[PDB]
């Protein structure tokens, strides 16, 4: 059973699992049923930016999702990630389709993590940046339908050769090195992740959306987690 | 009159102007009467570390002051820095003594400021790092009694040739370049400052403390701001 | 008399002052007559990129200029910058027009400088990044005709309200803080500079070019330095 | 067998395999017999620093090793690394002892790699920093005798419970994620690595050394590569 903390850009309302009745961003703590959601005006066909941030002083996980010249969507949840996640994790991106579909393309992805210890306050840091993805991206672990290199992008779910998306798809990309997201003797620890994404659907109704996630290091796509489950969770609980 | 936002490490309780009964860290918004303080166990003669952080999403100014192997002191305050400070600022370190005294020695200082715009989501960033100060530190604006180069440290208040700190001293170092801490169309702005310091006193009661501050670009040490005013405020209101 | 080190992007061959017969890049060490040049196929109207890098171990100043999908032009020169520059400098961008003309438009600028001392191996660093410029960009020093804000770009030379570049123009933007590009007791000092540019001319022959430069902190545009002099040298010697 | 590019800090003169007559640093291109060496006055028991850098414009691999207040040892070799190494590598630290011995203690390790592609000039970056190592350091592959966490240091070779270095020991630490050190379509690609070390020995002649290396990703310690082989090479050819 994986341990998942995620920020979801949820394009499709599943009101039967507590989704609000509109597209929304959310913070997910070991459940697809979001602890905090905000309305998000997803723009079919457009490049947007997501920013996710946390530090161990405020213990507050926050995300802003944005398109140029539009009002941002913002969401925040108070949570001690020390109590939720293991000491070492992987970080990734996840996306799915179900009966409705959309391209879940990633154009760029960056991440930064820093830990200062309570004994002689030495800082350990990790930073990665992808502004292009190649056919053979050896520092990503690609799971399920995820592919890299088409146009120099990361396509999290299946795209057919004519460029339209497919339903019932799920895939994820995880950064290869494990990440130390907390330590018991840290003065401050923090992270920030940003990615740019392009969600396009020929349907009237896109689905199912994209997530930034932090998981146990050995995490994999739960069985049957296409659709509303976003590649993250084994069920809707 | 200057506009001051500061994180104070207040070594001396002036209860007649609202200080708690004990050395305390605090967040100062345009006043020396902090908006929020927490108890701080200052350690005479030991090198400690301070970290200050803010971002435009949570709008929450937060600091942690620490010594190796001790419990941290932590303090936070909800505040929209957009509403308080001008678009352009200087960032700086400040310290004073009064009728009681201490060294106000800075061994390192770093600062990172980031803004991503709402118009195609381009990032502007400033970073500086001092892990040693030379006698001619041209990218530091030194005010009052502040000097650089002695042992490679920044001494914010006057220290005599024999190492002894002097009373009635006030001194400040501001980074040379102005800094853009907000813009009306930034999706996320954030900053982070760190410094190491060494407060030592031959007195029973050290005074008066060290502050990291953000100010209008033309800020200078207000008149008679030695002692309890920490080099920051013209008065005690 | 100023002391300039510079990387020139020279759009206009002035063979009377030792320019080669074609648009070219070059390294200039206290003279507009380049110590080294290489052929540069400038592309009228196209967004280009330049990179300048140097380190105190190799003592080699090297620059690459390129457009997406073209062969890069590269040039390098063996010079000990400690021998040439004062210890504190400013960094900047300069451009000019003369009887012929072009827009000298800067769309992004970044610079990182790092010094490690011979005792006790402590690093000082400076980093800045401009991915957009605003109307009042207080951390740039503008000289001559240079302005910021139109479209979020830095226009180093005069452009008219209608978009047309003007003859006989010259301007520079220097970053506000002086920079420590060297110190006597350094294990290693280095820097890198990147900028993107857009040179468009309605003339059959574009003039005069853009340079990245490093100078005495108190550099100004030498008088009459339009055209072939590039905002940089008082004469063609 | 493996493809290795290394910077050796070589404490023991093995004159039978072309080592010079004195402790030295060298650049190793697929052979233990360095393509260039410089004289290194290793200091028994004192914390040193090494810096290695390379960029694809100069195609010069260079290194500096120093102690506070000493003259530096520096060595360089003109080598085009995309000609030698595969497109994907891992970076690491290696060390060995044989009949004679020393502690190979790593106190800190940082690394930054960067690639700008020839289309659309997009940057890919990796950065890691260890200023402490814990007992369970999941983002390092440890091979052979290497251990982490004792005093927060990485011990590349065996040390017994009482601090005493052991003979016939070989160990390495690789960063976990693969690193993209060249791309055929790259404007400029570069890296820099820094480590701090403490080499301490009871022997009249300390042995054998520490290396920074870059290898095929699936590299392991070659068979019998203790002593003069430095845990890097299967033989001394
Ligand atoms: C009333 C709320 N609502 C709309 C928001 C809704 C409800 C039912 C369907 C809906 C939508 O859509 C479809 C669409 C299709 N197709 C695409 C046009 C053909 C493939 C077919 C059927 C329906 C059905 C459907 C009809 C009858 C029987 C079963 C289903 C069904 O979805 O059953 C599967 C599991 O659902 C069980 C009950 O769930 C009721 C909630 N409902 C169901 C859905 C669609 O859900 C699927 O698609 C979603 C979008 O990709 C994913 O998030 C889900 O993981 C996936 O199961 N949305 N809301
Ligand atoms: C060499 C001189 N020396 C150092 C040993 C010294 C001298 C005088 C005092 C000293 C110390 O201490 C105190 C302390 C207190 N209290 C301790 C918390 C509270 C009972 C009180 C009086 C003295 C006084 C004092 C007594 C009588 C008359 C005036 C003062 C006085 O402080 O004159 C100058 C301004 O004082 C006006 C009245 O202030 C009431 C607050 N009181 C006074 C002080 C000392 O304050 C001075 O020193 C502080 C510490 O550096 C600074 O923060 C202040 O800005 C600075 O003005 N602290 N609390
Ligand atoms: C390129 C076309 N050409 C060559 C046929 C040419 C063009 C202009 C002049 C020219 C020649 O010559 C003179 C000569 C004189 N005198 C004779 C020596 C004085 C009696 C006076 C004016 C002009 C001028 C002149 C007259 C009126 C206004 C301006 C100029 C001029 O800029 O002139 C700059 C001086 O050029 C002299 C010869 O140089 C040959 C190189 N070539 C290139 C240019 C254009 O030069 C200007 O424009 C260039 C491109 O922007 C800049 O790089 C230069 O720095 C700037 O001086 N001019 N010639
Ligand atoms: C430095 C002092 N020296 C020269 C006087 C010397 C030291 C040891 C031997 C030496 C010589 O010679 C031999 C010779 C043999 N034989 C005949 C060739 C076989 C019967 C056997 C053992 C020893 C050994 C030996 C004895 C006991 C345990 C190990 C060894 C050994 O490693 O020995 C490696 C011997 O290499 C042959 C001679 O090499 C001359 C160089 N000399 C030998 C060494 C020891 O080298 C070991 O230690 C070095 C330092 O750690 C490492 O760089 C080497 O990788 C590691 O093999 N260093 N310098
Ligand atoms: Ca949903
Ligand atoms: Ca006080
Ligand atoms: Ca020219
Ligand atoms: Ca050797
Ligand atoms: Mn949801
Ligand atoms: Mn106070
Ligand atoms: Mn030229
Ligand atoms: Mn050797």
CSV table of N, CA and C in Angstrom, one decimal, chain B residues 17 21 60 81 90 96 152 170 211 215 220 225:
chain,number,residue,atom,x,y,z
B,17,UNK,N,8.3,49.2,26.9
B,17,UNK,CA,7.9,49.3,25.6
B,17,UNK,C,7.3,47.9,25.0
B,21,UNK,N,9.2,39.5,29.2
B,21,UNK,CA,10.2,39.4,30.3
B,21,UNK,C,11.5,38.5,30.1
B,60,UNK,N,2.9,34.9,4.8
B,60,UNK,CA,3.2,34.5,6.2
B,60,UNK,C,4.7,34.6,6.4
B,81,UNK,N,2.8,41.3,2.8
B,81,UNK,CA,3.9,42.2,2.6
B,81,UNK,C,3.7,43.2,1.5
B,90,UNK,N,15.4,47.6,0.0
B,90,UNK,CA,16.7,47.0,0.4
B,90,UNK,C,16.6,46.0,1.5
B,96,UNK,N,22.4,46.8,17.7
B,96,UNK,CA,22.7,47.9,18.5
B,96,UNK,C,23.1,47.4,19.9
B,152,UNK,N,37.6,38.4,9.0
B,152,UNK,CA,36.6,38.1,8.0
B,152,UNK,C,35.1,38.1,8.4
B,170,UNK,N,25.2,51.5,17.3
B,170,UNK,CA,24.3,51.1,16.3
B,170,UNK,C,25.0,50.9,14.9
B,211,UNK,N,18.8,42.3,14.0
B,211,UNK,CA,17.6,42.1,13.3
B,211,UNK,C,17.9,42.0,11.8
B,215,UNK,N,13.4,47.3,4.0
B,215,UNK,CA,13.1,48.7,4.1
B,215,UNK,C,12.9,49.4,2.8
B,220,UNK,N,18.0,54.8,6.3
B,220,UNK,CA,19.2,54.9,7.0
B,220,UNK,C,18.9,54.8,8.5
B,225,UNK,N,18.7,55.8,17.6
B,225,UNK,CA,18.2,54.5,17.5
B,225,UNK,C,19.1,53.4,18.1
